[PDB]
Design a protein around this ligand. Structure first.
Ligand code: OJC
Ligand code: OJC
Lengths: 196, 194
């Protein structure tokens, strides 16, 4: 049954979408996950985490709810050298309660240049190591695209025994022509199948 | 007992940056050791060190972040997030019974200014009938709040005894070492927590 997902991602740019449009996508994806009775773990990634929070708080507070209901589990990363020493252990810890991991975007500024986000790759590896189903949203580009290609290349390793609907939905995760609503509905239906 | 840890900083009064970070780290670690839980809003200059101190204790004692000894509520940044900040603060402080205030400064209009968000969290704490622990020795908003409470002491700590009054005074003693200031804070919280 629908349980807890890890929502992985970071961004300073959003492939073919303007920032405000990608923010709406992340906000509405997070809201729809809540409305479908999922819980979310988020590491508050730059360019992503704030909009996850925004979508969840909209749904909670329209219902006089509370962040203490643990629909959204927040694990912001400690910044600086001491913090970085714990990031691997912290990731392995925070992913434990999740069973499905979703990957979005994955890019950051390093030395004044936009580069791929290795932390999203690390979260993919950790997720797979505990036998989570992984959901790389290739249409969002960057690491998520690399991960989508990796999974596509060894599909039966990641989704053994998948049915035709799963295969179609997986392909649509990489369809850059889909609207926000169409891409969200693809992700949600795929994650529901993987949770059931 | 669950405490709200309020604070933000881009500078740290008289202290060397790493020493102030270590103070925040060690305060958080010793709160965990003395069996408190912490709610943190992940304030700039503060939140990372709260996390560092808690993780150090948890991960040397076979612990997990899921035991909710440290409850994290990072703030959504941007215009939409700002619209929810007051409701988010009132929400996250609800489960706490005591609030601690550290530092409280930020950049505004190119300048280091006192952090109004820490003042807002003080007012919410008071409105929810939390006890307040303003660590005046850390300067900035926390010192303003220490002075305010000191001037209206019986409003905030009715019926306090000599020991409580001594500890409250020591919260503003800038001569104390890191460990002495931490011990003052936690012994005061222990009184306020029953
Ligand atoms: N001032 C900051 N304040 C708060 N948070 C920050 C800041 N600056 C960076 N962050 C975030 O720290 C994490 C560790 O950094 P990182 O591993 O180098 O980042 P990444 O490679 O982009 O990985 C992305 C994945 O890690 C996590 O968020 C990353 C960064 O977004 C999420 O779980 C992502 O899914
Ligand atoms: N890029 C950022 N990433 C993450 N977090 C950030 C960033 N930039 C700012 N923050 C934090 O947002 C909160 C709202 O901001 P604010 O109200 O303007 O801040 P403040 O006046 O300094 O209040 C301080 C109190 O608020 C909360 O953290 C503040 C800021 O530190 C805590 O609970 C404090 O105890």
């Amino acid at each position: 049954s629908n349980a807890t997902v890890f929502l992985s991602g970071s961004a300073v740019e959003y492939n073919h979408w303007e920032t405000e449009h990608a923010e709406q996508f992340i906000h509405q994806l997070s809201k729809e996950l809540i409305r479908k009775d999922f819980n979310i773990v988020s590491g508050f990634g730059l360019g992503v985490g704030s909009f996850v929070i925004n979508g969840v708080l909209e749904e909670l507070y329209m219902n006089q709810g509370t962040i203490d209901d643990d629909r959204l589990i927040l694990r912001p990363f400690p910044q600086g050298k001491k913090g970085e020493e714990q990031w691997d252990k912290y990731r392995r810890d925070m992913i434990t309660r999740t069973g499905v991991s979703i990957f979005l975007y994955g890019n950051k500024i390093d030395k004044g240049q936009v580069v791929k986000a290795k932390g999203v790759q690390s979260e993919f590896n950790i997720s797979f190591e505990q036998n989570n189903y992984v959901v790389p949203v290739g249409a969002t580009g960057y690491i998520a695209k690399d991960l989508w290609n990796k999974v596509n290349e060894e599909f039966e390793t990641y989704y053994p025994g998948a049915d035709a609907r799963m295969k179609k939905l997986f392909g649509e995760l990489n369809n850059e022509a889909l609207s926000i609503e169409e891409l969200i509905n693809t992700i949600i239906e795929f994650v529901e199948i993987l949770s059931n």
